[PDB]
């Protein structure tokens, strides 16, 4: 059937949508179409292109209020690619609190993490029962549900700045330095490469972390 309504969504809309890029995008919600148990929500991209989309590559173009997100939260959230800024879907691993500065921090589908503020957070329309189920990546679903399941029991190594430990990059082991800590962060450098990534304390791509 062809519905108007469906639960607090309203033909018409404004919303955000996943393209095949796996970045989300402006439009406007045209169509929503049942198949039984089934739904999907049809969307015009501001460039007049058209996708025919599941409950969970859909959200509202708002910011969610504090008591709406919850460890496990499926968002849309601010991806801060070199100098380049992209809405990209993720998992929220920390709420606001003292020792985070009041941030979230976000796990994003591709296994980068980052803080971010309230209004960088976009919340996803129809998310699944167990939500890291539609993350394409087998391993980084599976931490994910490690994660969010455990929580709030975290392993994370403590680590200063100045030591020197072996990260993890394409499958062997690399001589870096921790270089900064940002709450459940740290900033490492690659010593022969000469460059930084933030990576989770929690992470196994952290050798102490991993043994
Ligand atoms: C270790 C880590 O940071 C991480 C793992 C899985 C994922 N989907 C996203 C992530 O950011």
Redesign the pocket.
Known sequence: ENLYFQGDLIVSMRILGKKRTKTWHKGTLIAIQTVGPGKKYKVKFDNKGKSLLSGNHIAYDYHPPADKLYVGSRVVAKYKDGNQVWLYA??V?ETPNVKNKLRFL?????????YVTQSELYPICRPLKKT?ED?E?I???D??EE?VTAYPNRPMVLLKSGQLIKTEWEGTWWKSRVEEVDGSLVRILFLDDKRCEW??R????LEPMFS
């Not at 976000?106 to 980052?114: C, E, H, K, P, T």
């Not at 929690?202 to 791509?205: F, L, M, P």
């Open positions: 993720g998992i691993a976000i796990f994003f589908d591709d296994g980068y993490a980052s890291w993350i990546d391993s980084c679903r931490f994910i994660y990576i989770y929690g992470s196994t791509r």
